[PDB]
């Protein structure tokens, strides 16, 4: 209400969900072929056998323990569901970022109501209350204070934007490597093979 | 502002009512609601193609003031179509504009359903050799600013006044020098991977592969390849 | 170079014979791609958008500093010479104080954005150096790190303030459907391919590679036995050729 | 106050440009993270994944 | 395990009889440190017989 607005993102939640659904469908139906060009269908059992070969396990292990592997995967997905449903603070990074932005905005809003050495922090009172010369010098003091506050807010916003850009670059690299293919880097896409 | 009927209950000893930010919200009972305000953006396809523009009022329900309403506000001067195309001019909330000016919803991509089924695979029978161009900045122009000269401009009294303001000029000069040496180090680490300058043989027989267009040319324009010459001529300093 | 290209084909899981059968086709495709890049760079503009953007950002920052140098900052004049020549030492001192405060604030702000941009450019240069090390000096197995498809190699070129990587990559095309099976049942034993995939065109079963269609007859040399046909889901009955009985007989 | 600030300088333009650049950067991050694939794939109606 | 020698994979226990098919020969056994004496099955003699 004081010149502070929140621009809606270009990509809405529905389209981001559609992106994730398309990526998941390509991964399940094709694996890594869709990330290198046209998608190629695979029964996803032979794809998992190929992934086992990549990690260093022969296809016979999977073709003999497919039921056990599927049961373990389903149990792990259920455990993740239970952890996300019951245990809290599972999204600490996103919550921390949101609270950081909110705290910065609230700090700027509070700084908007500071005297900065003036008679009063309300500009309209000064204008309707005082004659041009010293009213102008008091307005100048208020402008200096508010400009300093907004400049430091912009500086920290730029720093946080750089941090978020680095995090997003890391996330894009993970999506390109972990999701669109099989990554041989250790601990890049989770602990273990 | 706008005086509105207030559902809030004020105690008999209360005269004003302030919300967050310690700003006046209600006055003895009438609520103060600042009248409609917001930003105004102009969507244009470039002065070359046409002079027609569209006006976007964000965070404003312009029913009070080819009108289309979106989660990003409201657009005037662009027709709304029910089709979907690639996003040309991003407006927001999934709404984009293109060139009359048309406003639509950005299409996420071509929709297809892969023929998934067990005991069935798709195997390529041919290959394509695709070369993709990727551009990465390595460094930027190194600039040095003389703080004393910039602030003063050949004045001794200003220099004396700046001297007792502290060593801000030294800090700025050190930061600029660090930036310059950082750019130099970035260029060195990017372009000095090898310690030996290898030369191609005079005869070029690489099994049919032709690299004369990426190798230096006999014309010797600063010993730059043809593609490098095109890249240099594309950027205007 | 043909042997190096065959090595890189082996890196992406394609045998050397696929290359040696179509060496001329691969060379022609590479030349056509180079010519296409030439045509795109000659005709299409804004291909170097990142370098232009950073250069424009630096120029805009410098121009903003120059323009801000001509601000009164609450003083009578924006030029110091006039104030010095017009005012007595105390009033001139006050005006110079105001001017220096304004100009120092502007310079500190400009230096702050310059440092932020320098950090961003350093990150970009580190990424470029990593790409040069892992794609120009070798073959990268990372997906989409150095192009869309299976990476083959990369070529570096200079740019006024950057590096241009021409990533040569392998893209599958002209795909056909086939019927598969996890293993082959022969003599009560399950056979799995050493490397590749079991496929069928409708009547006959072959074994080939995943990234290319090179059908071959089922043989004990390219298959291994790891049990019976009672545990594998999707077993398909077929004969397995033994390249020893005809030699013995 | 508007006259006094325009007499002060042109910081507001730089600040608005920085904020717009930050917003465009955020949009670019979202696009590069989520819009890697140009084709939308749909899972088959039959859920037979072994 | 205690008496018999097999060859397996690194990440899984799938013992198999030592054979010339899954093993390769390189020089004599007077240089390798820690080599042990064991028989190597040749899957051609039973076929000939
Ligand atoms: C508009 O752009 C085209 C690009 O093909 C150019 O040929 C033409 O001269 C431009 N027009 C103006 C008025 O700049
Ligand atoms: C704008 O106001 C109209 C009526 O005044 C209302 O129907 C409409 O929903 C409002 N817009 C939004 C986005 O809520
Ligand atoms: C065409 O687009 C208009 C938007 O102006 C919409 O109201 C209408 O329903 C669309 N027609 C369809 C979806 O058949
Ligand atoms: C065969 O492959 C094509 C694409 O290559 C696919 O659209 C089709 O569903 C497949 N099956 C057929 C034609 O029975
Ligand atoms: C593969 O495609 C090339 C053109 O890119 C063509 O000349 C060649 O005949 C094709 N090969 C097959 C087996 O279809
Ligand atoms: C490489 O291409 C250029 C232009 O396409 C041509 O002039 C040159 O002769 C070619 N080199 C060979 C060895 O064919
Ligand atoms: C499958 O391939 C074999 C040998 O390549 C051939 O004899 C047979 O006719 C083919 N069948 C079909 C249906 O194409
Ligand atoms: C494929 O699925 C069908 C039914 O879903 C089943 O009858 C058949 O045995 C399966 N084949 C393989 C190889 O999994
Ligand atoms: C494969 O052959 C075995 C014995 O030869 C038989 O018991 C089994 O039913 C066969 N399977 C199929 C799918 O024909
Ligand atoms: C080791 O394994 C072999 C084969 O399974 C068996 O014959 C032998 O008794 C085992 N020895 C011990 C000590 O377990
Ligand atoms: C292991 O070390 C012992 C001494 O502790 C030695 O007797 C034995 O020969 C060594 N074996 C190998 C395989 O190195
Ligand atoms: C293995 O056998 C050879 C001769 O057959 C013998 O010289 C050698 O000592 C044996 N190895 C051990 C560890 O006893």
Numbering used by the authors:
A (entry chain A): 855 to 1047
B (entry chain C): 550 to 577, 584 to 620, 641 to 674, 691 to 828
C (entry chain C): 898 to 1146
D (entry chain A): 749 to 798
E (entry chain A): 1098 to 1146
Manuscript excerpt for this entry:
Host cell entry is orchestrated by the viral spike protein that, upon binding to ACE2, mediates fusion of the viral membrane with the host membrane. The ectodomain of the heavily glycosylated spike protein forms a trimer where each protomer consists of a core S2 subunit and a distal S1 subunit. Each S1 subunit comprises a receptor-binding domain (RBD) that can switch between an exposed “up” conformation and a “down” conformation, where the latter is inaccessible for ACE2 binding. In particular, sybody 23 (Sb23) binds to recombinant RBD as well as to the prefusion spike glycoprotein with high affinity and shows very potent neutralization activity.
To understand how Sb23 neutralizes SARS-CoV-2, we determined the cryo-EM structure of spike bound to Sb23. Lastly, a cryo-EM structure of Sb23 bound to the spike reveals that Sb23 binds in the ACE2-binding site on the RBD in both its “up” and “down” conformation and thereby effectively blocks ACE2 binding. In the pool of particles that enabled a high-resolution reconstruction, approximately half of the particles had one RBD “up” (1-up) and the other half a conformation with two RBDs “up” (2-up). A cryo-EM reconstruction of the spike revealed that Sb23 bound two conformations of the spike, one “1-up” and one “2-up” conformation. In both main conformations and for both “up” and “down” spike protomers, Sb23 binds in the inner edge of the ACE2 interaction interface of the RBD thereby effectively hindering ACE2 binding. Modeling the ACE2-spike interaction based on the ACE2-RBD crystal structure (6LZG31) of the soluble part of ACE2 bound to SARS-CoV-2 RBD shows that Sb23 hinders binding of ACE2 in both the “1-up” and the “2-up” conformation. Interestingly, ACE2 binding to the “up” protomer is hindered in the “1-up” conformation also from Sb23 binding the neighboring “down” protomer. Hence, even if the blockage of ACE2 binding in the “1-up” conformation from two independent sites may contribute significantly to the efficacy in neutralization by Sb23, the interprotomer-medicated blockage is reduced in the “2-up” conformation.
